[PDB]
Amino acid sequence: DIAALVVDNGSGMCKAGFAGDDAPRAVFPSIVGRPRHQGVMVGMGQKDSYVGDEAQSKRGILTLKYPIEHGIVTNWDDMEKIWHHTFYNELRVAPEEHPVLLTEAPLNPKANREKMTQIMFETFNTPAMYVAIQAVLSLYASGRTTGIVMDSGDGVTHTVPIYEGYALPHAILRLDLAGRDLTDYLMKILTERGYSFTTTAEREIVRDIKEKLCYVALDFEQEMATAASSSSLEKSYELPDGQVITIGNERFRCPEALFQPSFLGMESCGIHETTFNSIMKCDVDIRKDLYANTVLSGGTTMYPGIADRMQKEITALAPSTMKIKIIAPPERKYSVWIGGSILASLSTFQQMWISKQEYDESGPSIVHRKC
Amino acid sequence: QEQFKKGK
Amino acid sequence: FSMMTPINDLHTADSLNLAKGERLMRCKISSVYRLLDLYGWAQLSDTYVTLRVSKEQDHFLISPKGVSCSEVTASSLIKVNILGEVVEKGSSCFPVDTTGFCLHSAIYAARPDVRCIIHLHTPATAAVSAMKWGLLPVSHNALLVGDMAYFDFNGEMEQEADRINLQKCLGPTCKILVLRNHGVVALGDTVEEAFYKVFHLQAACEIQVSALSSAGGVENLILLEQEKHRPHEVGSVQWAGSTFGPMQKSRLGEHEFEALMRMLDNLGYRTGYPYRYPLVQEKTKHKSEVEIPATVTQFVPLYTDPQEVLDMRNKIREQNRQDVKSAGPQSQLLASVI
Amino acid sequence: FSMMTPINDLHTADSLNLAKGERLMRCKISSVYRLLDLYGWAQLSDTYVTLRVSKEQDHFLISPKGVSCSEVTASSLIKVNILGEVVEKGSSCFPVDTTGFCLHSAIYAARPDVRCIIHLHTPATAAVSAMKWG
Amino acid sequence: ETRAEFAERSVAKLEKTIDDLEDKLKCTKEEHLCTQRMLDQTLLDLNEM
Amino acid sequence: TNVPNVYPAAPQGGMAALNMSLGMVTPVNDLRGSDSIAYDKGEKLLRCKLAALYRLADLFGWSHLIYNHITTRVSSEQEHFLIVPFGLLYSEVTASSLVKINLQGDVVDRGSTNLGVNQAGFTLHSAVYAARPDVKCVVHIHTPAGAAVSAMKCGLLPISPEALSLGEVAYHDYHGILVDEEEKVLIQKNLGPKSKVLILRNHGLVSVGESVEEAFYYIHNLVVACEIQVRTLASAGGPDNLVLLDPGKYKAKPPAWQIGEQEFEALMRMLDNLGYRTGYPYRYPALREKSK
Amino acid sequence: PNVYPAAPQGGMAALNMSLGMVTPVNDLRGSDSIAYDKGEKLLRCKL
Amino acid sequence: ETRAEFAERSVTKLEKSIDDLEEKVAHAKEENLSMHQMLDQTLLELNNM
Numbered sequence A: 001d002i003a004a005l006v007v008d009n010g011s012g013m014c015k016a017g018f019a020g021d022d023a024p025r026a027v028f029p030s031i032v033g034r035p036r037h038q039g040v041m042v043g044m045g046q047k048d049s050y051v052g053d054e055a056q057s058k059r060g061i062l063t064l065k066y067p068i069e070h071g072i073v074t075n076w077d078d079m080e081k082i083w084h085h086t087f088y089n090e091l092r093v094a095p096e097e098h099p100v101l102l103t104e105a106p107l108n109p110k111a112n113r114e115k116m117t118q119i120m121f122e123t124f125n126t127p128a129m130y131v132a133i134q135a136v137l138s139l140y141a142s143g144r145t146t147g148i149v150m151d152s153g154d155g156v157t158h159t160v161p162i163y164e165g166y167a168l169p170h171a172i173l174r175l176d177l178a179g180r181d182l183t184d185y186l187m188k189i190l191t192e193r194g195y196s197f198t199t200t201a202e203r204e205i206v207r208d209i210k211e212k213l214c215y216v217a218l219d220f221e222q223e224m225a226t227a228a229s230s231s232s233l234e235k236s237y238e239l240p241d242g243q244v245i246t247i248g249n250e251r252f253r254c255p256e257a258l259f260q261p262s263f264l265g266m267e268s269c270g271i272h273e274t275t276f277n278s279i280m281k282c283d284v285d286i287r288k289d290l291y292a293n294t295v296l297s298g299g300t301t302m303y304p305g306i307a308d309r310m311q312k313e314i315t316a317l318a319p320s321t322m323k324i325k326i327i328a329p330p331e332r333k334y335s336v337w338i339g340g341s342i343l344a345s346l347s348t349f350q351q352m353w354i355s356k357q358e359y360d361e362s363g364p365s366i367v368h369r370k371c
Numbered sequence B: 001q002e003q004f005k006k007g008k
Numbered sequence C: 001f002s003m004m005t006p007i008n009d010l011h012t013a014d015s016l017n018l019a020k021g022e023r024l025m026r027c028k029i030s031s032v033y034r035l036l037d038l039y040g041w042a043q044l045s046d047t048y049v050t051l052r053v054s055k056e057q058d059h060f061l062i063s064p065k066g067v068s069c070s071e072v073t074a075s076s077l078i079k080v081n082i083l084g085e086v087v088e089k090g091s092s093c094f095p096v097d098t099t100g101f102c103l104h105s106a107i108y109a110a111r112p113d114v115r116c117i118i119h120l121h122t123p124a125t126a127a128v129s130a131m132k133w134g135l136l137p138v139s140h141n142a143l144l145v146g147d148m149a150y151f152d153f154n155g156e157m158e159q160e161a162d163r164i165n166l167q168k169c170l171g172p173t174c175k176i177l178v179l180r181n182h183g184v185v186a187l188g189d190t191v192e193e194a195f196y197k198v199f200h201l202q203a204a205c206e207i208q209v210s211a212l213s214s215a216g217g218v219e220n221l222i223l224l225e226q227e228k229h230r231p232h233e234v235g236s237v238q239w240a241g242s243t244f245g246p247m248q249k250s251r252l253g254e255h256e257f258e259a260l261m262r263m264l265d266n267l268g269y270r271t272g273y274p275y276r277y278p279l280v281q282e283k284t285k286h287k288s289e290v291e292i293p294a295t296v297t298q299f300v301p302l303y304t305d306p307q308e309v310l311d312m313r314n315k316i317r318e319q320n321r322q323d324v325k326s327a328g329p330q331s332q333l334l335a336s337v338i
Numbered sequence D: 001f002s003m004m005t006p007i008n009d010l011h012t013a014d015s016l017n018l019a020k021g022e023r024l025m026r027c028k029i030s031s032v033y034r035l036l037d038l039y040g041w042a043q044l045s046d047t048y049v050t051l052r053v054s055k056e057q058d059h060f061l062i063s064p065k066g067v068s069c070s071e072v073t074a075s076s077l078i079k080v081n082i083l084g085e086v087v088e089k090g091s092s093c094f095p096v097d098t099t100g101f102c103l104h105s106a107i108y109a110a111r112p113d114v115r116c117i118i119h120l121h122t123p124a125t126a127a128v129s130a131m132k133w134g
Numbered sequence E: 001e002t003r004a005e006f007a008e009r010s011v012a013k014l015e016k017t018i019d020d021l022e023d024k025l026k027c028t029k030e031e032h033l034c035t036q037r038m039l040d041q042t043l044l045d046l047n048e049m
Numbered sequence F: 001t002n003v004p005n006v007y008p009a010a011p012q013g014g015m016a017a018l019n020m021s022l023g024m025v026t027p028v029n030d031l032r033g034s035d036s037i038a039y040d041k042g043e044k045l046l047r048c049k050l051a052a053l054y055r056l057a058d059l060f061g062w063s064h065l066i067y068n069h070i071t072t073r074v075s076s077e078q079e080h081f082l083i084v085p086f087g088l089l090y091s092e093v094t095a096s097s098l099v100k101i102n103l104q105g106d107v108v109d110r111g112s113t114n115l116g117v118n119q120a121g122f123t124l125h126s127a128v129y130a131a132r133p134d135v136k137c138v139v140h141i142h143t144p145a146g147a148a149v150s151a152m153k154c155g156l157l158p159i160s161p162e163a164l165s166l167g168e169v170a171y172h173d174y175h176g177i178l179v180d181e182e183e184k185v186l187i188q189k190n191l192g193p194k195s196k197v198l199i200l201r202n203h204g205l206v207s208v209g210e211s212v213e214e215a216f217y218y219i220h221n222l223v224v225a226c227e228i229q230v231r232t233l234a235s236a237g238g239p240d241n242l243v244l245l246d247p248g249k250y251k252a253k254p255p256a257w258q259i260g261e262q263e264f265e266a267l268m269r270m271l272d273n274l275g276y277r278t279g280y281p282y283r284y285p286a287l288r289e290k291s292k
Numbered sequence G: 001p002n003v004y005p006a007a008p009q010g011g012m013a014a015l016n017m018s019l020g021m022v023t024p025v026n027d028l029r030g031s032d033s034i035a036y037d038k039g040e041k042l043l044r045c046k047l
Numbered sequence H: 001e002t003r004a005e006f007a008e009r010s011v012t013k014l015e016k017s018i019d020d021l022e023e024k025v026a027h028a029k030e031e032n033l034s035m036h037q038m039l040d041q042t043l044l045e046l047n048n049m
């Protein structure tokens, strides 16, 4: 029983699993580490480069770099290393026996899809592989075929509306405001408290701090007044070396750059304004449904209170007669993969696979013919 | 199936 | 190509002296004129439909002469006394003729119960009225018509003898008056009930005309009799509405009139009729297990010169070049001792 | 809101073969069908009007089955022989049936001078034909 | 472990009742507003002297 | 600033123009969109077909206010039926506004409207559906000539091929007592095992079928033969003034569509060309083969 | 719309309205009424 | 243990919310029927004239 493989890639996270399963088998960060210190211990285990979950264990002696930034790959060799580690070390399955399903950002340059297809057929001898949109699969995971979806990952944020299973290409909006930039901003605003983080491992530590002790304020000025006038909004984080820091005021300051990019100084508008503009670009007749179905996707939208603030900010710009509701599934981190696990399981999808033999007469552009 | 039918 | 005409221009015109209930009555009685126009039963005004305004003071709403049923608006209609004199004139420039009102007045002096009168001149109704037999109970609509009275009409209702003869022969409890060789007259406590009876008479008249055309003779029609069973039409209009409580109770013609009048409101006829039963369209609800419920229900001054800064640093650097010796500032306490 | 259908569209196809003044006379039949739709006489598909093309070789024009009278065009007509077999089908992707043509074929086999045949099923003519007085 | 999975399943069961009751309240709002404007028209007719 | 346009009206054809204006304003199929997931394909198809037939029946002048109802059996699960709400005219019938009720008139799905179902109009359809399991669509209609032919002693004489194609027809006497339960049993034997067309005495006509198009075909042939019989016997006034043809040896005379699909499909071609955007599935979506 | 949509039994009247739209009956204009009587111009309108 | 305790927090909060919204919608229906009766008697009083 040959089953398809679903591999979801994003800048900072790679997931993989068999089609038709509830859970992905492998989840690990998309990191590549190379040793930085002088290695002098003859006879014990050293390697040229560490990748995946093993590299995150040895952050002290490694320089950690990401192959993908902003949804665009920078070094393809590191991407090959991650794919090889996923196919061999994590799942222990042959890549040339089972078909593989791949996802990417909607708006992207020409060369990315062609290079990805060329590498996936030539290196691993994949009999069939298909490319799909991430946000469309997230909407399929929610199980409604219509509505506007917001997927904000660690690489890039994008809102696409899908009506009757079609994503309108003109109404797609993309904003380069992700969680890694929020991590950098949190590091910059933690500088003024007296704690200094400069290395890449300290960036991962700051990211863990952001994941554990951040939340979204309903009213920004009132929360500033409360945090200035009282010490109730203070939590203590415990560093891996035993030191204790107090996060204090900054907890609602780092995620607020999502709504106001003037803190980062970005020219573009907020994420809620981006969603509102994407709704404005569509036809009037469907706008009701676009205001009726909106789901949140991505790990960046796991900040507490994101749904209430999003609903309030959309309702502020919306007409008074419109009804605004926001859907937030609890498993919004892994929705995209779940959608892939739906899409490969259908009986009409076996003809949707790209043929290995057809690529021989077509070439690397074949995906633009079929997808 | 019928979105494959006319295009893509 | 613009056959839409606003039926309620009372607020726009603002040039009339309306009574306590004219705002509802005028629209209500223009709606039936529009419905008579749409069904095509009458197009040229022969004073078909008349309304009674109030019981304390007998004023009656009638249509102006020379105005087609398509052109009838609520403000264009006029109100007159029982004698026929004009009390208040509508916003229509036409000569006033109340000749055909008198027959309607012959109804109003007899029965205080009736409030609206409709006269029909359709070919089927006139065929049944001119027929030797009356409305034969050969159809379900004719059974729903009910009892009726026949009277010979001769063109005048102005002398007292004809009026008292009509009031005597009409009877205390009769709803339909058939004028021989002239047509039918429907009496109504409410406009909806009278329009209901008008519709049922028209349907039964067409049915009788077709039936007696089809078969030579009455005996071939094997007609049933209303009298033998004597039903009270109980059990009609069983209702299971969700917004209101389920009751059988309804008037004779409300439910049919509400749908027609909402039809009229949908296109753009700005009617002022109040619906007893409000209607809302809403999107349907889902109970698939897939659906997830929603979570909720200066530093720098404004005016300055960079050239000032450049000239200042040139002044300092000039003193650096000259190397002029100068002591620092001295305290005023040390200035005292010198 | 789709607009009115043009009656002569055989120039668009330019694939069927034409014999003598067929380019004119085909259109004539279409006009007749349209005229029926203007009078309410017939609006459902049946073998109403057939036309002989030429005095020789026995070619006839009939309407396709299942097509209402409002949507008949010049290029949608069907050319058959006396036996009813299709010789040159029109530009209409519908299944063909010629069981109603046989009576018209008998009339055509009777009279060589008769060229155009019109059949109607309106209530007045049907009541007159059912009537023994005629 | 057991009480955690129990409580989460209870939340998942309760959400649908939450959403259904909210929808019912919104429909009662709509029926409220229709008759509010209806009384507006009725009292506009009644107020004239 | 502008109301939706109204087509100008003939002196005797005002309400046909009214219906066609209303149909171009409000589409008969409004379930398309976010409501596509709410209903499965099989039930949505029946809802679209029934709403389209309601619009068609209002266009043809066969509608008698709200007094008549047309019912279809839902193939999904068992004993579920569709009906128009009581209070809504035939011209505003849309696909989503149809109300699904089970047997004996209890409401299962409320629909998009606030109105409730009148069970008194559903008693006859409940009796018919309980009589025969194969019947799926029941159309109760009232044409002006139909009451004239139903009031006849002789009934529908087989003097036309349209009356010949109907076959054996049943007659239900108009008791008028409005009994609570005996009406169902009387109707149940008075239909018999196989009778496509029933003519109510002095009331109207009703046709049954296992499909929508076949029932519409039977009711159309019944109306046409009704007009033929009315005019012919109006002229005749006696058997010596007409000729009657016997049916028994008149009858001696991809896969294609079933019975009655041509007339229905042509009439939805009318409705789509008129602007109703029904979305009815078509066996042949295009009239002409595409150019090479 | 050059042509109005047609009723099942009222197509000819619909074409009459369409032809009323396309061709006005008051063909006489200021320049086109030269050497023409006034009473005849009034009567042609009615006819 | 912390995660189960968070689940219990959510359980009790939404459990109170459903009761509040249910009694509110019951109130709304209760006096909606009252104004439904009152508009009808006003229109009947107009009909009596």
Ligand SMILES: Nc1ncnc2c1ncn2[C@@H]1O[C@H](COP(=O)(O)OP(=O)(O)O)[C@@H](O)[C@H]1O
Residues within 6 Å of the ligand: A009, A010, A011, A012, A013, A152, A153, A154, A155, A179, A180, A207, A210, A211, A212, A298, A299, A300, A301, A302, A303, A333
């Ligand atoms: N529990 C959490 N709470 C808040 N933020 C989180 C949480 N988990 C992850 N994130 C943020 O989401 C980012 C990961 O997003 P991810 O879903 O991996 O994007 P993609 O899969 O598209 O690359 C991380 O950089 C982190 O900042």
